[PDB]
Curated annotation (Swiss-Prot), chain A:
Changing residue 309 to T: In NEDMSBA; uncertain significance; when tested in a wars1-knockout zebrafish disease model it partially rescues the ocular defects and is able to rescue hearing deficits and head abnormalities. This is Tryptophan--tRNA ligase, cytoplasmic. GO terms for molecular function: ATP binding; kinase inhibitor activity; protein domain specific binding; protein homodimerization activity; protein kinase binding; tryptophan-tRNA ligase activity. The modification Phosphoserine is found at residue 327. The keyword Ribosomal protein does not apply. Disulfide bonds: none annotated. It is linked to Neuronopathy, distal hereditary motor, autosomal dominant 9: A form of distal hereditary motor neuronopathy, a heterogeneous group of neuromuscular disorders caused by selective degeneration of motor neurons in the anterior horn of the spinal cord, without sensory deficit in the posterior horn. The overall clinical picture consists of a classical distal muscular atrophy syndrome in the legs without clinical sensory loss. The disease starts with weakness and wasting of distal muscles of the anterior tibial and peroneal compartments of the legs. Neurodevelopmental disorder with microcephaly and speech delay, with or without brain abnormalities: An autosomal recessive disorder apparent from early infancy and characterized by global developmental delay, delayed or absent walking, impaired intellectual development, poor or absent speech, and postnatal progressive microcephaly. Additional variable features include cortical visual impairment, seizures, hypotonia, spasticity, and sensorineural deafness. Brain anomalies including myelination defects, cortical atrophy, or thin corpus callosum are present in most patients. The gene is WARS1. The modification N6-succinyllysine is found at residue 130. A motif ('HIGH' region) lies at residues 140-149.
Amino acid sequence: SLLELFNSIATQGELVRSLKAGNASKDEIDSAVKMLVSLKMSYKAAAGEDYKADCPPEDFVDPWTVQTSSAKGIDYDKLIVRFGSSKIDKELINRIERATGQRPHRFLRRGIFFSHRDMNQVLDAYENKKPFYLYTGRGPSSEAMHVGHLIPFIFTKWLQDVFNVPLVIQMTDDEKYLWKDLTLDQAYSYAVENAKDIIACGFDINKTFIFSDLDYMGMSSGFYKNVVKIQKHVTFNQVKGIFGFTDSDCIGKISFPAIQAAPSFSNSFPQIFRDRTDIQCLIPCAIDQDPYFRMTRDVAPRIGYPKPALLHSTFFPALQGAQTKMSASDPNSSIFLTDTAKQIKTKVNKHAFSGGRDTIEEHRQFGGNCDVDVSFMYLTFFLEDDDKLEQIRKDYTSGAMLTGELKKALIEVLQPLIAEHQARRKEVTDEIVKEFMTPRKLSFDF
Amino acid sequence: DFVDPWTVQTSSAKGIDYDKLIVRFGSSKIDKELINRIERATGQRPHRFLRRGIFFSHRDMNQVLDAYENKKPFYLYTGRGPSSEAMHVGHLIPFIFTKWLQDVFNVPLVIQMTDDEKYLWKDLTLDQAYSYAVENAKDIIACGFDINKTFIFSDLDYMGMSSGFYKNVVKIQKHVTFNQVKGIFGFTDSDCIGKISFPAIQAAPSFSNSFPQIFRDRTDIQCLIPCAIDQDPYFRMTRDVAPRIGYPKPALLHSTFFPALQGAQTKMSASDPNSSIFLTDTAKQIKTKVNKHAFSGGRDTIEEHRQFGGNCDVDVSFMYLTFFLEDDDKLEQIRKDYTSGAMLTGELKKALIEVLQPLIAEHQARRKEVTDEIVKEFMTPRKLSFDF
Ligand SMILES: Nc1ncnc2c1ncn2[C@@H]1O[C@H](COP(=O)(O)OC(=O)[C@@H](N)Cc2c[nH]c3ccccc23)[C@@H](O)[C@H]1O
Ligand SMILES: Nc1ncnc2c1ncn2[C@@H]1O[C@H](COP(=O)(O)OC(=O)[C@@H](N)Cc2c[nH]c3ccccc23)[C@@H](O)[C@H]1O
Ligand SMILES: [Mg+2]
Ligand SMILES: [Mg+2]
Ligand SMILES: [Mg+2]
């Protein structure tokens, strides 16, 4: 009865947490909160103490949705053909190894970063001592990013280290203002807090410019000019086809794709690239962002600029299964970078979908299915040793390793990952975030 | 019959029915009581445009005067789409009036040069559109605006030099749907996304915290927008969105159109060179355009002119005199004599030429004194001679 009241508060609290992360209105959030407050006040009177969460007593891929009915997840090979991108083959990976002299990142080795556009052109430029730069971004939809968001940022940090190039990181607080029910100050504050998470991945302050759109649009001699250029060469019909917008949407949403396109061109950042328009751009992202840059690549030559190159990642799946991606707006979907060791353990054991059989004795006989097991999927992203991953795959598949064992292994990887990130995030002072976010000349001459 | 920012058209030779237009647009007619209130507030004789019903319609001008009489601040906002260096005397109508408003009320002024607009609509580069904004700014400065109280700005330049302007553009963009701009401006889904979002950029200068070096974080300062009535749809949209984003509605003063040379059925516009008397025209070119091309309301043949009489309601040369002939009594005498048949078109047109020649010549002389340093200073974000 009192335990049943506790669980109802935990369920409703998680629902309230998910609503704040998604595109719900403040009035919808307030209504959910009023239920939560009502249950907690009933618990306080019944239990004689406050509630604390610790103590019981056809595949669709676009920027906003990843959905499939398959338990195995998105058919990434079919997605390449549909989007018209190029498969990252062994020959391209070997070329990156030759050019950098570094072991290919595990995401490349395991086909996590699996698709590209014009990556050979980036390597042509690099091998001929011509400059290029990295561009990625974050829509600061709430405070606290999740482990899924580490996939593009870890890879971008690796690319920056091995190629030694400047990086621009777009914080689209204007996007989030347009799509969510937020004030401008709330959207900007989420961008600053999310920048601290991004900085905690270990990007070099001498080589990295992280910018708020709301701030940078008002202080740049090139950025708005490029936005206007891009806006002339994209129609509403085109963005309706690409992004699924309708005439009931606000004009800000309709025009926003040009703002995400604009950082692809070097003269958007005149203080970094000495007013030059010919610096190759490379854009690491998960493949859901590709519609923005398919559009950007079509526009590029019409305004006299080179097309940006792409590197596309797979999706870090939701805890409930590979049917959806990990998303802050879905209940019990995410492992956040603010989660404690307890909460990481709890989420993996309670919520991570198992491909193992229902009983232990059945598991010994028939074995597990790694193609649907979420815990094994997470190990493909974060277990560093390739031989250990394969050993775990074989043993789980044969039945020699149980679900409990597989989850213990994962928890021992995710706990230090998130803890070390938190340790680095605490070192990020207000002075450091400001410096990362101040328009300035980076340590590169052009 | 049809009036929007891109076209003014009517089958009538008398021109636009301005009284019916007030009713359709939902604006307010300027009456003598309002003109008297402006006189008492300023302590100056009302401008000939007000006296003769050229500036004829308004929105919330009583609220502007309420604020002004109670010693509250207001500011002026107008603009120019720099399509080319080729401006004409019809463009002087809003800027001459705005300059008078600045003097008599003693208020700050912002002038928007929409080079981004003309890039989006016309076959121009960014630098070409910007260059026209600079050249047009010299023509605007030549009307005599006070450098200590006037901020002229390129959208392309100023968007990147403002902690306030883009933030307001985004606020407006969030609260205006595509269905609304389709309904207001007649845009279609084949239009570029820049055209669809542009009305937010023309809306943004209506709100004072767009200009932080002039007004800081103040969101309460009354705005007043002089224009010809073709711009009204932009500010119908602005007035509707304002309360939805916690800002006051901008007030308006609407002018009539300086008609085309060939007739009042169309307004004077640079897009058709034959309709326009340009500000770059010489004395000789002003004679030729008035004599040969300015439509006559008089009868063909001299005998019929004295028998039947002239028609001031369709005569373009008389219409131009109502805008620029300074004496009211002489205008009425010319109206009487032309209507009765005493004055012929030739005599009417000759009197018009004697007003337009020194009008344009003096403007050309004042424009020549506008240096590169003055236009630069006008266009630099800075604090004006006002405290808030
Ligand atoms: N479950 C997941 N697994 C793997 N990757 C994921 C997962 N969820 C999100 N991502 C990727 O993380 C980045 C940020 O996502 P956003 O939705 O904030 O992303 C956004 O809202 C953009 N509008 C911000 C942006 C601006 N410019 C860019 C350039 C590249 C990438 C992103 C941007 C993205 O790379 C996204 O693909
Ligand atoms: N034949 C005529 N007779 C009398 N007045 C006329 C005639 N033709 C034009 N006007 C007025 O001149 C100003 C500039 O016109 P634009 O078409 O450049 O105007 C434009 O292209 C705007 N998008 C620029 C703008 C931005 N903000 C503003 C605020 C007020 C007025 C104008 C603006 C206008 O006042 C216009 O009403
Ligand atoms: Mg997001
Ligand atoms: Mg998103
Ligand atoms: Mg006009």
